[PDB]
Each structure stands twice: as structure tokens, then as C-alpha cells.
Amino acid sequence: SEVVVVAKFDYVAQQEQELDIKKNERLWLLDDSKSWWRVRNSMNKTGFVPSNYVERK
Amino acid sequence: SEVVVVAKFDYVAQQEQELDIKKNERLWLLDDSKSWWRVRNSMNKTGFVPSNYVERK
């Protein structure tokens, strides 16, 4: 992308869709305009949707 | 999960790790303290990391 971020802390991925990162590692942020929530639907699929497209019931 | 969220708008998934949602669809929010960013590392591996574990370089 056009946005580089730096890991503040290590992160151990907990799922296949997550990424292991080390403190001080530089990464591409794929679209700064997009924060995601991990959600599960009524057909038992888990994935990501933009946080601003959903709201807490 | 037990935290219910409701789609404010339709969202057509752009990637297989995202979900298609329709306005008014109800989902469960998993990791409800967690917002995610999609990042790509120096080995061109892509995945989600918690948005609070990275900052703008």
C-alpha cells in the first residue's frame, strides 16, 4: 500500500487469518480507512467486516 | 459468542477472509474489545492484527 505501520508489541496469531508480528517490525497497512471486526454469521462462517458497517445490538 | 451486532448496511466481501453481510443481518462479535487491521509483512504474507498492536511509522 502507501501506509507503513510499526509493531508496538509482539503478536502471536490465534487463527489462520491472523499474522504473527514482532515488536519493531514494519508492515504495509492495507487500507488505513478500514478497521475490521471478527464476526460469526447464522450459517456458522467466521470472518471480517468493516467495524463501521455493524453496531452492537 | 454472546455479543450481538446488527449490519447497518450491506457489505460485499472483497477477499475470502471477509463476510458478505446484508443490512439488518445479526451476527456475533468475537474479540469484542478488538478492532483489526489487515497488514502485509516483508515476506508478502498478509493477515489481520489487532489495530492497537501497531502504529503509523
Curated annotation (Swiss-Prot), chains A, B:
It is found in: Cytoplasm; Endoplasmic reticulum; Nucleus. It comes from the Eukaryota. Phosphorylated on Ser and Tyr residues. Phosphorylated in response to activation of EGFR and FcERI. Phosphorylated by activated PDGFRB. Residues 2-57 form the SH3 domain. Only the first and third SH3 domains seem to be involved in RASA1-binding; the second SH3 domain and the SH2 domains do not seem to be involved. Adapter protein which associates with tyrosine-phosphorylated growth factor receptors, such as KDR and PDGFRB, or their cellular substrates. Maintains low levels of EIF2S1 phosphorylation by promoting its dephosphorylation by PP1. Plays a role in the DNA damage response, not in the detection of the damage by ATM/ATR, but for efficient activation of downstream effectors, such as that of CHEK2. Plays a role in ELK1-dependent transcriptional activation in response to activated Ras signaling. Modulates the activation of EIF2AK2/PKR by dsRNA. Interacts (via SH2 domain and SH3 domain 2) with EGFR. Interacts with PAK1 and SOS1. Interacts (via SH3 domains) with PKN2. Associates with BLNK, PLCG1, VAV1 and NCK1 in a B-cell antigen receptor-dependent fashion. Interacts with SOCS7. This interaction is required for nuclear import. Part of a complex containing PPP1R15B, PP1 and NCK1. Interacts with RALGPS1. Interacts with CAV2 (tyrosine phosphorylated form). Interacts with ADAM15. Interacts with FASLG. Directly interacts with RASA1. Interacts with isoform 4 of MINK1. Interacts with FLT1 (tyrosine phosphorylated). This is SH2/SH3 adapter protein NCK1. The lineage of its organism: Eukaryota, Metazoa, Chordata, Craniata, Vertebrata. The gene is NCK1.
